[PDB]
Design a protein around this ligand. Sequence first.
Ligand SMILES: [Zn+2]
Ligand SMILES: [Zn+2]
Lengths: 707, 707
Amino acid sequence: HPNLVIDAADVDAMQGAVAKPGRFRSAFLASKSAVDHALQVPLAVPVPTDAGGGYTHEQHKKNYQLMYNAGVLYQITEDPKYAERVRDMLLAYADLYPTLPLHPKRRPGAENPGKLFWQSLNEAVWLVYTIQAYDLIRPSLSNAEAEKIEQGALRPVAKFLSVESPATFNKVHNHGTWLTAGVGMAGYVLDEPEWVEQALLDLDKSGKGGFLRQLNTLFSPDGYYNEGPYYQRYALMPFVTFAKAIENNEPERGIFKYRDGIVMKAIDTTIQLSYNNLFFPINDAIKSKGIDTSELVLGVTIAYGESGNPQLLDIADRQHQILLSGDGLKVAQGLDAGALQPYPFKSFAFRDGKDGDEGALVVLRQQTDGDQALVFKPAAQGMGHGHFDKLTWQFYDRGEEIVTDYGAARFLNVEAKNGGRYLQENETWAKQTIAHNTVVVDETSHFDNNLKIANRNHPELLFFHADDQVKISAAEIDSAYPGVSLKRTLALVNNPESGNSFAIDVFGVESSQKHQLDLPLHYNGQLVDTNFRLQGFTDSLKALGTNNGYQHLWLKARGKPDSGLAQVTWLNDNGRFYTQSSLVDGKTELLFTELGANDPNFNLRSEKGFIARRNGARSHTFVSVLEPHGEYNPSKEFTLEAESQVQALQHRQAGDLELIAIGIKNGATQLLAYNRSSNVPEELENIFEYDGRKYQFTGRAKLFQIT
Amino acid sequence: HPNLVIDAADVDAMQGAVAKPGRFRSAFLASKSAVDHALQVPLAVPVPTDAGGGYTHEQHKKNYQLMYNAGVLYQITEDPKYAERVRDMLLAYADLYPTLPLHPKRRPGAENPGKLFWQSLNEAVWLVYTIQAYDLIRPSLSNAEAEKIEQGALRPVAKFLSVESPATFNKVHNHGTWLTAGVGMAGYVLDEPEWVEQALLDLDKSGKGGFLRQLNTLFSPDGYYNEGPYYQRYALMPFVTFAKAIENNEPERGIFKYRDGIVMKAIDTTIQLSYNNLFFPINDAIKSKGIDTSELVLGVTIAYGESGNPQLLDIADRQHQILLSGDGLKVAQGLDAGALQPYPFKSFAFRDGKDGDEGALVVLRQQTDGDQALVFKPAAQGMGHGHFDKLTWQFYDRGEEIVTDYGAARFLNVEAKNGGRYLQENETWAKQTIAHNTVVVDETSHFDNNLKIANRNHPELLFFHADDQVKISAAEIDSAYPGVSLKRTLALVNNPESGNSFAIDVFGVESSQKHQLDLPLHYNGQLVDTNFRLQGFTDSLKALGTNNGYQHLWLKARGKPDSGLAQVTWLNDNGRFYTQSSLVDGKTELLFTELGANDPNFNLRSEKGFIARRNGARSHTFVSVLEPHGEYNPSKEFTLEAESQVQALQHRQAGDLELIAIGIKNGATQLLAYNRSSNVPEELENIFEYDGRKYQFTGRAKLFQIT
Ligand SMILES: [Zn+2]
Ligand SMILES: [Zn+2]
């Protein structure tokens, strides 16, 4: 009876593969050992009393996982003990569920209620796994056992998640995707076709919500999910699960061709939104989440099963987790056959919006100086999970996040931390603009915290270009603060001769009115030196400000460099020094902060940053260069080039061109020249004059060496 | 000509091994590649201008490293390009060194000056490496080149390091070992036997100083170096280097048998004083230093060449660094031959003092619940790098430091941080007792920071016992504070029935006068719960105190739990929760701190801790249990047992016995019973009554399960 993600054909293929040495057999033996041990322990289907991370919540989660794993073993081995365990647990659920009220630890202000769980989302995950387990063990049951499980457990849960909470079922968000996927698959297993249609087109079958609306709205043409990478991988699992079930049940729907293969694009982009295996922590996001997460392990197997792309074996190899499925077997076989090819992590502008015209998530990468990623976020809001952070950036180098995004104020599945829920400081700190590396006007967050306006306004991607020496993008938004135009261009560059790299930042603010302008740099590392006088406050600390996140920042020190070049140098665990060299006009303060004020429940990390503060400016440009330099090896006990190699910095406008000149110690000046305007063909010619000589280049941009 | 660590026998064996494939050939090729690349850069022997971490400091360090490596490559390849580079660098040193003043960035308060370097310590390392390089390339030289090199560089350096700085040269400390090693090896190479004898017996050759006194004084009979693990590995290099040269030139001295084989013991104990490859950060210490440090890579090859112990190959394998020497070949061959045997990290009391009577460094390990180490420090002062930390402890679990020692306030080889020197806050914070996990009386450090009193006093180790279920040690000191006695016993225990483990702490304070008593607990991880009301200060922070390190702690929160059981729970990145359960009397405050006050140069990390404070006590006992519990997996997204499983705690005396009974939720109480007397035969019988039942055990201690 398996006919959801796994079908009978997959079981027969798995049965043959299990008795041949290889990755698949070894994964099978490991699952079998674990399930056999778990079968020794009595079933635990407790009355639900705990919130996220609590015993009842985690036990119910463990139950769905065991029921799925045992069902897979039952199909492969034909051993009845696996089905009997799944049956006994389902009979227990069938007796418990009808008697359950809404969860005692429900918090409806945060999320909709569940019966098994504090929130409906976990119940939806439970249905997605449990329906598959039932589908896998259904041939083992008597008719009365099936009827009791369906009438007491499966149908009441399907009803609870759909007709009984219809607003969320018809919503176009990850929570909707989980609910639609579970009820739709239940429609297939229990022969309820209307449930499949309700999953695809909403409860009214209108078309306004449902699975198809989600695929047409939440993803851009580049496969980029509007809520961001961390919820991208989360929603991926019900997308590829229900899509695999649609293809096995109604292949005439052409689900894997729908919207020009959007399901495959979505899988691939999920992989791309990572560095050193971790998803970029933009918007609401837990920084530990990586590509070995179960949703992307599954997604890769499904995409490899559809395409046979050997590049996906590279990812599967890094995930270190063989799945007991037909597609999981295909992955295991390609790996055993040596078919692996490297996976191409791209510099790319992943467009945002269903039509691709609501900004973009830009990733700039280069390997000349090690693994480096500059992540630029001129993206749309991302809805409730979105941060108020237009044009913010991050910088990754040598395995580590150097210029940082906080992610969410949330301790996942830690019940003592408010049931693992999003904390108050996720609104008052983590979402605020001052928590990001982008301009804050008048100590006020972008859109002044107005969700509806934020949801309707987005930056415009002006351009993106990437070649071997220059990766560069610019974007603009005039709606973050009406009357203020915010424009940023960021370049990731490398010089082949030196082996050196730079991140270059040109942040232009233009207003007809005077404003306070803050540009934070939140960094990871230890402050080691400054160009200018800086002594920290010594016997008391006070918060930087009063609202919009400023109330959480302790002010540790205040500097006001003389006009010219300001330099801030820190040292990272990864063995590198980082110096930001910025142009200051003598009216710019540098405020050094530590996160942790107005934090009575110890909910925030002691993160460090410095803010460039320019008061009373109508128009201002923040020009800066981030220089990774030197080597620090505390094991062999040597240090090289600990001092910044930048001596001078100049920024000039030359018609439609922007020039950034970086003077290097005992070295040639690095001169970034790029064309500023919208459309620039690849062979367009440019010249300009710098220091009495003439320079010429084709296309968007060129880095010159001036000896 | 090579006759020091490397002799001609070694060279011959290496030459035949570099043709055959294997670990040695791969190391050779990697070295040859690095040096060949170095040879294409012209030599740089600059006039010394910078302090530690600066250009000339790090260049002169690069130079001795390259001279040694190029010299070894000369001997193996017989290719004069390597010797010619070494020759040309030494001729530049011969011309430069006699013109040199004392170093312009000398800081004679911190360390004695050098000429090549700001301190003579680096000059001694330079000599140790360079005398070996000169020895390796000598047969390539003309007599006039040899005379110029010896007259202008080698002899002036050796003379500057001995007769011109005689106090330090005759000193018995790590600075002394480096100086005497270089001069003694110069004595062998330049045929100055008086220098060899001065190296072994001091300049006046009295025997008060010198290398034999160092081996007889700075190590205990257990091979524990008095200054601590971080300086043990430092001194280990000159110790084993000179010893190996002595054995190759004067094997009649039997140096590897001297003092019951102290050198081999010294190597083995250096390996023992680590957890997950890092040395215990006690006394002045840099936390990143681990067993791959060059001194211990060398010491392990030399011990393997002496003893052939296949267990040393385990360490070598973990170090991942084959050495181009005769011993390093033998190590590579044994590894290739698959002779590796697991190295045994033991529970052990490493005695302190020349004769092993000045306290001890006690390490308790178990493996039942993962890799765990309890480090207890009832040790001698350790001279000027010693910390004021009698009876302090650390806890390590699942790869991480959980209960912490700060180590030193110093940024090794970062010139912008005071030349990589020990910083002011090393004295005012890192050495202070409040920075450690031990009792502070009246906000005053042990011995009141008086180094002369501290050097004359040490705790007495009372007992130490390790079996598979209980590891336990106790010690006491009555001289840390006038009229106050301090006694601590620490136990590491495991229960087989559950996978559970506990660290048990009983800290007794006895005095005829009332005092304020502080017991800090410095922890690594995120605070997640308390069983008593705790709200952090929200709008400002102020230092906890005014002196002896209290001026560096921000007080973030204050709690006063009710009489009974206090519980503090934090979450560590290793995926485990930790709960300290402590007995409190309603009069004990718990103060939550963050390091960072009075730190104007950003010299301190933001470390966290909590302090149990009890005022007006004459005698008081701090009883607590540290419980690692649960699993936190944010990749798979599950949590198990996040809540502490301790329900109750009781401490009782029963004659010569102490009882600690730990109530477990849904579990048998764990009852630790141990005899307190110094003398306890293994077959001694103990009997006590607890809750109506009678219990008996043989020997020192036993953990009982009470259902
Ligand atoms: Zn964010
Ligand atoms: Zn210390």
